[PDB]
């Protein structure tokens, strides 16, 4: 038997699910056939409608106290929950019901971790984080927009293999992935130190791989593993290595708040 997972999307863009389709360890096919039993996921489920709601209800009962609950997207509280309705009920109700029997609860992505883009600006829907809707529960936050999928997958694997979550920081983020500032482990730090800065995309410094601080890099104020784990497992691929500043998408108050070219504060 494989450990059960229930995945509910709230105000999600599906990018966090899509991250799984880039993963290699495990690939999404090995995740769903070998690693876990994905008991509810609306993107992939054969069943729809009343049949898939029956699957969820049956799984919540059969696996009570055993499943990992995962949520992507923010949860909208304005106007009594009506900005996300599934099977005629506010998604916040579905989430609180599923949370009652969960062994572990994960907020995958910046939206569920801290509200993310959906809670930015004027916040039209009163979008909030998963932790905000589950005050009695310890929610493990795996931020990023979307995170590298293995930030999630190795968190799940730690729960499965060793029986507990990975070590967390004071935002309940796994330290293996979020324990250090990007700027405190960035390969362009020597250029920062020397005052070697790209000033515009396509300029001479930019075309030599110089530091992107003066383009608005938010590496100095964003915790993450983007410079080390990077993305897609091909080698050498993260925003800064491709030539664009970090936007701070991991980090509340940075991504989706600060402008791309706004300068970060440096510690």
């Amino acid at each position: 038997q494989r450990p059960p997972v229930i995945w509910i999307g709230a105000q999600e863009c599906t990018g966090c699910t899509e991250s799984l389709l880039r993963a290699t360890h495990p690939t999404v096919e090995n995740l769903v056939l070998e690693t876990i039993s994905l008991e509810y996921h609306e993107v992939l489920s054969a069943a729809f409608g009343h049949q898939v709601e029956e699957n969820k209800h049956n799984a919540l009962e059969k696996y009570k106290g055993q499943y990992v609950l995962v949520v992507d997207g923010s949860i909208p509280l304005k106007d009594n929950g009506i900005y996300c309705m599934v099977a005629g009920e506010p998604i916040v109700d579905h989430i609180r019901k599923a949370a009652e029997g969960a062994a572990a609860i994960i907020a995958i992505g910046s939206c569920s971790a801290w509200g993310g883009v959906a809670a930015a600006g004027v916040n039209p829907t009163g979008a909030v984080s998963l932790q905000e809707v589950l005050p009695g529960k310890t929610v493990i936050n795996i931020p990023g927009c979307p995170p590298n999928p293995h930030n999630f997958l190795a968190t799940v694997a730690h729960i499965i293999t060793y029986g507990k979550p990975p070590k967390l920081d004071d935002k309940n983020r796994p330290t293996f992935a979020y324990g250090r500032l990007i700027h405190e482990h960035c390969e362009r730090r020597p250029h920062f130190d020397a005052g070697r800065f790209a000033k515009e995309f396509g300029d001479e410094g930019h075309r030599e791989g110089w530091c992107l601080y003066h383009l608005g890099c938010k590496g100095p104020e964003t915790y993450g593993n983007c410079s080390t784990l990077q993305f897609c497992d091909v080698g050498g691929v993260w925003p800064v290595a491709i030539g664009h500043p970090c936007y701070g998408c991991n980090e509340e108050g940075i991504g989706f708040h600060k402008g791309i070219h706004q300068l970060a504060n440096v510690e």
Partner: protein, 551 residues
């Protein structure tokens, strides 16, 4: 009649409810409802025009890249910026590779379980399954041994009692027509698809900086630094690596996905005669290759009342006829202002009042083109290409028809493309033609860099006073996308996205005319109203994306 609701519709992006009235086992009327809103248009307002693309890209992660690219095109339009040709090549490679992943995942992971019965695959003979493909495909992974391995994976999953994503599927439903062997083949291909789509996104990642959600755009071009001799930038080694993944895509696309599309049509020919959503079709040209945001590799146009011979070509993203025709209404949507609005003057003022059959019932707006309902997406884009006499499109369609004719003895006429299966076929044709786009644009990039052009970015200036308006068009995997930006005193004063699934999924409009999803369902046979598989088959053919539709 009987009233049913399908909520949630699964194997789509996002939150969709479909309601149907059924008279004597035939759908007589339907309602499509997007049930989640974020207000992404309001979120992006009052910011620097340069910032919009990073925010509005998050409209959707399935069609990642698309809103990023439309947004920068919209700001570039407002500012009158001509994008460097190397930035076009890079944008084009990203869009084509992304769309390759998107279409493959749609056919297999999203749609195949409408047509394929996994329990029937357990009864298959793997050797007979393999023999069925002799002379039909040259794919290297159709052996009995491959199929036995796949069969055993299914067997092991069923034996565990933990069916997960496969639990309570429509196994043994009367509308499942494939023989055991063909069901087994399809499951093998579903798994093999996952490898191909992963390679497509490796292309995207190497230029975008990651995927989902690329990070290499700018208003004025791209952030990739082209320098063949540079350490840590887009050099020849990196370009070679990108090419290595481009080269891995074609065989699966041509020898698996294209073939499976013909075969599904061969076993389900009734589905060439239902699911017509509209009589008008729109697509925009795509893949610009000159220094002035034009010279598109794929053509666009407008077809009215299904008449390909009288269609109107669209060859520019600044076409005033296209721009002036687009409006959206909220008469039957949960917004306050109901009369048709041009998007530069659009509002998005929420006004939720619950479901009413005759009133408001969706967060999706209702777009029209000069007052008509229009279907967008791969059926539109295929029909426009056929209307344009694009040989590449006609030839690719003819390859699908030739396989279909080998299996059935029948041909396919254009009339039969206005249907659920025609929509699927258009998508497959698109994916196939996109492989040549990738080769073409990689070669263009290498050649241009070789002439000494390393330019990628034109720094914009944004006047601090004045009001000006821009629109960025893009032919997305699900159809024509437009982002509409108004800038006033240097910041975004209006932002409206009109997205392909908005055209297709929108509710009844200001004149109570029915949109494509709703129209397509009229006439659908429903054998078991508790398990309306037939309704979902037609809806999935449109590749719904409700984060896109509603934003």
């Amino acid at each position: 009649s009987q009233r049913i609701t399908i909520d949630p519709v699964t194997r789509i992006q996002g939150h969709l409810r479909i309601d149907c009235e059924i008279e004597n086992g035939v759908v007589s009327k339907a309602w499509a409802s997007g049930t989640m809103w974020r207000g992404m248009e309001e979120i992006v307002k009052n910011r620097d025009p340069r910032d919009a693309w990073m925010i509005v890209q998050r409209i959707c992660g399935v069609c990642t890249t698309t809103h990023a690219l439309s947004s920068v095109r919209a700001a570039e339009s407002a500012l009158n910026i001509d994008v460097p040709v190397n930035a076009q090549y890079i944008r084009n490679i990203i869009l084509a590779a992304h769309t390759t992943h998107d279409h493959i995942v749609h056919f297999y992971q999203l749609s195949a379980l409408d047509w394929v019965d996994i329990t029937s695959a357990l009864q298959a003979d793997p050797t007979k399954a393999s023999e069925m493909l002799k002379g039909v495909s040259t794919w290297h992974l159709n052996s009995p041994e491959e199929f036995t391995k796949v069969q055993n994976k299914i067997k092991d999953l069923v034996a565990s009692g933990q069916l997960g994503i496969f639990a309570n599927g429509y196994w043994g439903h009367p509308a499942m027509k494939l023989p055991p062997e063909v069901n087994l083949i399809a499951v093998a291909h579903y798994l093999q698809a996952l490898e191909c789509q992963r390679d497509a996104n490796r292309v995207v990642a190497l230029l975008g900086g990651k995927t989902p959600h690329i990070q290499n755009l700018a208003v004025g071009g791209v952030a990739n630094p082209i320098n063949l001799d540079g350490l840590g930038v887009l050099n020849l080694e990196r370009l070679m690596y990108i090419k290595s993944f481009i080269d891995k895509l074609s065989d699966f696309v041509e020898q698996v996905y294209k073939v499976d599309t013909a075969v599904i049509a061969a076993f389900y020919p009734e589905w060439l005669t239902r699911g017509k959503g509209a009589v008008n079709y729109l697509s925009v040209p795509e893949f610009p290759t000159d220094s002035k945001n034009g010279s598109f590799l794929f053509p666009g146009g407008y077809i009215e009342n299904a008449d390909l011979s009288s269609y109107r070509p669209i060859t520019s993203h600044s076409d005033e006829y296209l721009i002036k025709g687009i409006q959206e209404s909220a008469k039957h949507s949960w917004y306050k202002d109901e009369a048709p609005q041009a998007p530069w003057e659009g509002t998005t003022i929420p006004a939720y009042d619950g479901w009413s059959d005759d009133g408001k019932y969706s967060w999706v707006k209702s777009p029209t083109f000069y007052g008509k309902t229009v279907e967008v997406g791969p059926l539109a884009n295929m029909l426009v290409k056929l209307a344009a006499g694009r040989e590449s499109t006609q030839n690719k369609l003819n390859e699908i028809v030739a396989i279909y004719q080998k299996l059935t003895g029948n041909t396919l006429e254009v009339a039969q493309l206005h249907s659920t299966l025609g929509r699927i076929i258009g998508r497959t044709v698109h994916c196939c033609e996109l492989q040549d786009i990738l080769q073409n644009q990689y070669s263009a990039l290498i050649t241009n860099i070789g002439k000494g052009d390393h330019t990628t970015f034109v720094k914009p200036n944004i006047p601090a006073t004045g009001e000006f308006k821009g629109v960025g068009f893009l032919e997305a995997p699900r159809g024509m996308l437009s982002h509409w930006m108004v800038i006033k005193d240097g910041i975004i004063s209006n932002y409206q996205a009109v997205v392909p699934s908005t055209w297709n999924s929108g509710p009844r409009n200001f004149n109570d005319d029915v949109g494509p999803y709703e129209q397509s369902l009229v006439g659908t046979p429903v054998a078991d109203p508790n398990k309306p598989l037939e309704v979902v088959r037609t809806i999935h053919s449109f590749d719904p994306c409700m984060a896109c539709a509603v934003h």
